[PDB]
């Protein structure tokens, strides 16, 4: 049993309305300390060889479903459940 | 300068349509190894005393904007940018 | 061929951090005319009897996947593609 | 008082992982009638001249906050609350 962690974000360089909105709404409420906000989708996949082979598999999941390379960047962390 | 990381999820015990959907769509495509999926929103707040005081501040941001305790659970990690 | 439209929102009475955030960020930028914001997920399902029977089917999709009654309210519109 | 409705979607031609996922998870559960799914974010803005002038204003909100033209397409409907 392994836990794969998939972080998905917008391509580097693409402005993110969600981040910008959170920032401004935060400053609006008084938190002027907040200088910048960014958001991501975190996807935890719990699945059944070894971590490198798992990473390969989720890599495929991303490639053909989870993320769109044109607008998305993503990264995968695989930890064995012990 | 500090980087506060806010993870927001649904209350423990509430079924999440997104997780369930991802799982089934994943099994549907062949990845029968995938046994369970869960999703979270990750919010990175870059802001300007010390980490415990920062955590207190984002704690407030959550309390009055970022998350709704009725339907949300959340956790905060604060790292000093060095 | 029919187009089913599924609108999903938070239960009536549950505060929505997204709506609140958008509002404040909007006022923050100058749009003080904006008095209130609300957000929804719109899901267009294109599928293959008649509209009432389709509505029944998507009703089931919602019931067992698309939405969680505990935290979600939803409504379904079915139009025949002509 | 007017209700502006903002529909935001991915640019025409960009594959949407959410839509694809919903479709497959739906077929996976038996709903083979479902042939295609698409998703959108609906944003209802309740605000305070006349509908054409309101549309202009939300147009600006979109242009500078709500949506990113590079990855987003959007449309605005303005109805006077009567």
Curated annotation (Swiss-Prot), chains A, B, C, D:
UniProt entry keywords in alphabetical sequence: ATP-binding, Cytoplasm, Ligase, Nucleotide-binding, Purine biosynthesis
GO BP, one annotated term: 'de novo' IMP biosynthetic process
Subcellular location: Cytoplasm
Matching NCBIfam families: phosphoribosylformylglycinamidine synthase subunit PurS, PRK05974.1
Similarity comment: family membership: Belongs to the PurS family.
Protein name: Phosphoribosylformylglycinamidine synthase subunit PurS
GO MF term set: ATP binding; phosphoribosylformylglycinamidine synthase activity
EC main group: ligase
GO cellular component labels: cytoplasm
Catalytic activity: N(2)-formyl-N(1)-(5-phospho-beta-D-ribosyl)glycinamide + L-glutamine + ATP + H2O = 2-formamido-N(1)-(5-O-phospho-beta-D-ribosyl)acetamidine + L-glutamate + ADP + phosphate + H(+)
Function: Part of the phosphoribosylformylglycinamidine synthase complex involved in the purines biosynthetic pathway. Catalyzes the ATP-dependent conversion of formylglycinamide ribonucleotide (FGAR) and glutamine to yield formylglycinamidine ribonucleotide (FGAM) and glutamate. The FGAM synthase complex is composed of three subunits. PurQ produces an ammonia molecule by converting glutamine to glutamate. PurL transfers the ammonia molecule to FGAR to form FGAM in an ATP-dependent manner.
Entry EC number(s): 6.3.5.3
Record carries keyword Nucleotide-binding: yes
Quaternary data: Homodimer. Part of the FGAM synthase complex composed of 1 PurL, 1 PurQ and 2 PurS subunits.
Pathway(s) per entry: Purine metabolism; IMP biosynthesis via de novo pathway; 5-amino-1-(5-phospho-D-ribosyl)imidazole from N(2)-formyl-N(1)-(5-phospho-D-ribosyl)glycinamide: step 1/2
Lineage of source species: Archaea, Methanobacteriati, Methanobacteriota, Methanomada group, Methanococci
Main location: cytoplasm
The species this protein was found in: Methanocaldococcus jannaschii (strain ATCC 43067 / DSM 2661 / JAL-1 / JCM 10045 / NBRC 100440)
Family matches, as InterPro entries: PurS (IPR003850), PurS-like_sf (IPR036604)
A Pfam family annotated for this UniProt entry: PurS
Keyword Cytoplasm assigned: yes
Record field: transmembrane: none
């Amino acid at each position: 049993m392994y836990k794969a962690t998939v972080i998905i974000k917008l391509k580097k360089g693409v402005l993110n309305p969600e981040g910008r909105t959170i920032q401004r709404a935060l400053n609006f409420l008084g938190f002027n300390n907040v200088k910048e906000v960014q958001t991501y989708k975190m996807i935890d996949i719990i699945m059944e060889e070894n971590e490198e082979k798992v990473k390969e598999e989720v890599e495929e999941m991303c490639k053909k479903l989870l993320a769109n390379p044109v607008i998305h960047d993503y990264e995968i962390k695989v930890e064995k459940i012990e």
